[PDB]
Amino acid sequence: PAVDTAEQVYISSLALLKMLKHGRAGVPMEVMGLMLGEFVDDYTVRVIDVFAMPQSGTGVSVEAVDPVFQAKMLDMLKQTGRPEMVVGWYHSHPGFGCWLSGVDINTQQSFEALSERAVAVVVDPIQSVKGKVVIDAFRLINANMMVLGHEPRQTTSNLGHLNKPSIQALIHGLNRHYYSITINYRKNELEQKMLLNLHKKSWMEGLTLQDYSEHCKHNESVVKEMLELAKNYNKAVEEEDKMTPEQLAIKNVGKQDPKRHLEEHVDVLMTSNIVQCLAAMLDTVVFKLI
Amino acid sequence: LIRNNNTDLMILKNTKDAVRNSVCHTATVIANSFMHCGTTSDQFLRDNLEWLARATNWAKFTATASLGVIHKGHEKEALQLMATYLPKDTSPGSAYQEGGGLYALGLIHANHGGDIIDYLLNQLKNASNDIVRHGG
Amino acid sequence: IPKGYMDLMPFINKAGCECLNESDEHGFDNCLRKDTTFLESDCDEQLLITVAFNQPVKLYSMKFQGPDNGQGPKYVKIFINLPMDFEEAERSEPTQALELTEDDIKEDGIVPLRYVKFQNVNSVTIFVQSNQGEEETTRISYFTFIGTPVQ
Amino acid sequence: LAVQKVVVHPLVLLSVVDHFNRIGKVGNQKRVVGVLLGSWQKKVLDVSNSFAVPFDEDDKDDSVWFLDHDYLENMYGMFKKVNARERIVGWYHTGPKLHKNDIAINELMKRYCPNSVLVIIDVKPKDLGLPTEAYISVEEVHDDGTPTSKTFEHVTSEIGAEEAEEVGVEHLLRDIKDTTVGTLSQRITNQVHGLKGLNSKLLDIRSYLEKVATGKLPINHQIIYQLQDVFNLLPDVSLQEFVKAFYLKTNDQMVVVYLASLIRSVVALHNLINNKIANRDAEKKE
Amino acid sequence: SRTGHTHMPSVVGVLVFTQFWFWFPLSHFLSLAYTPTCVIGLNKDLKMPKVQYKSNCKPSTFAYPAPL
Amino acid sequence: DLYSRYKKLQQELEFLEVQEEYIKDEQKNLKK
Ligand SMILES: [Zn+2]
How many other CB atoms are found less than 10 A from the CB of residue D260? Predict the structure, then answer.
């Protein structure tokens, strides 16, 4: 039997946030934990939930898995409807990409001895930005099989070669001592609507009128700001008439652009005043004494 | 196609020496079946038997299945033709070949399984391996 | 047993298969047995079986047999891997609600199961909502699950 | 009070939903209760993690209920080892509304946190409001003479995220969230939501007054006291002083919009000039 | 087809061939789309006579590629 | 060929509506 590149690691919405929260809190320590879930078939590894391991002490590296902590948490999670086996482990790489070092390879061999399809997921909480999390799932290449002249896994599809390996990972042993498993995310309608509540302002704020003394003062200041910008904007028009096309951008570097700031001031004021007017007009009928 | 089989085996060989991976290996086998589809000519597979043996797991499934593409329209004898290529029973890694033979057989009788349906229906019924059920 | 799927009765934990509302004279131990002894209930014909497996196991079909006197089941609700109080069975979502017909409940009838929903079954509970002849109590036979281990 | 605002992080909401979906499986569909973990910053709570606790109650009797408090201590120590700065700040339950027995449960939780904050986290996706309702237990001293009783006082709740928490949330909401809408469109959508929220709350008060009118619920005399204050605060927009000031203010903002629109047209014509110069220059050389 | 009918095996073969993205063995379905380009002469006996059709164009405009 | 030109133009017009609908839709998602 040979592993397939079509294999996918499915991380739930809950499991993704816990690794990011634990990984960011533990910066720069390679804070590790266990990934609970279920090996659905030979091509799916589901990560329903994860739980973080304590740090035994100081040191930016992956510590050994504490069997008592693992046994006690697994035993207690079964009491709250979490009877899912450990399908691997996760650890954080705070800013230097997602790969496995020498210590991580030994840590993964411990899991592969118990479960042959265990997955080592690496999360980069520092390099992860909004809408794009730097995550990767790795499983070791047996040196005996690859040295003899066999590919670590068979290729029966395109699914395993859609993501181009990074140079940082290829430097640190990717496709030599471990291989990457494509990661998909299990998101349901309920969990998506729940997260949409983030930064959702209260209904009071929509009808709340900004302080009129400060609104006039802000209108006062910004209109005065455009007074100088308009004076500078006239100079920019004459200057750019007699400017070589190589200086259309170089000469704009380090010097403030009157046109650009004029648009920002116009955009801010027109959003500010229209909302203040519209909200005020709405409140005159909604909150009416008659 | 048999009589007018003006295939160019120099093109296939020039890419056989450029095969270094399993993906490039299975590509040539699918390529081989394409240039010889309906020509009933497995000359490339006959003269490169030790090279074809490098295929493992589903590449064996694809390689055995390539026979049906080559022998498409060979209604005259296909059960004996496939059994000639494939022994009845084999222990090591024969599920991919046995399953591939069944799906090669359907490739021979594509849209024309007048009487091979009963054979494929029996083998799928008396099938234990998941791979053989896949080819069947 | 159907070809390719074994009788899973030896696989289950006999010590660990509990029953709810079971008359003492005929109990769960006599239920799993192939012989004539049954599993009758005391409080009502309504009865709740709980079956915990030793290893992960798939259930392809079941033989939940009962005597044709009318005490055999006519409504079986199957629940998989619950984290069951005779009120949940009244209002819940069974994995595959099954109306065990007279052919299904005799000594030879087997009941097909939705093999899709029965794949990872570490513990299964079968509930008898109603019997065939509207009697006070029910009776069972060698209730065995036919399938294969997850492995 | 002791709590000014409760900030509930998206991890808790996902954890609470997962708690409900794994206990409220084929077993049942009751409310599930867990334990809230977070820190304290000035007077705003920072609920940031939670773990489930075994819990059950009787559908009929409210005084019969069980909470595995030993399980509470064992997992708290489990969580304290990973993150010591995250202490118990209260409990949660997914019940769509409060229950009669929460005041008893809070007393059990009050041992582990004296200022325990109960946050009701509705798993159902309510359309207009936040899923979180944060309550704290207070001793209501009635003036009618009725003896002082323990009650829940509402605390304003907000959903905020950590930097890495918000990174993952934006990843999960990458496709669903539409960020193309400008600020001005968003603010008007806030006003529509504000109108919808007010109408719903006005409907709730009207529904309560309907029950009181028909005798379904008793006359409270604290809600009615508050209701007179609400109707008294209703401003008179027909006053001459107010209308003139409103016109005085509206015209003050209009001239600023007019000036900004006037500048916008000039800048837009400057862009059109550059485009036509670029287009003419490109075709001259080609 | 030559008449204009939607050739069912050709349509089916191409789509399942495009599923080689998910399953490489599915690439053999393109054999269904391979329609031979021929003119078959027959008699009243449904046999093939020695008939030599004439192509009124240059031999090189439609011919097999020159082997390497 | 007079009917064919009229019908060919009708399909070409209808295709233009399809193309102009998808371009506006793509512009909305390209901004996203
Ligand atoms: Zn590492």
Answer: 25
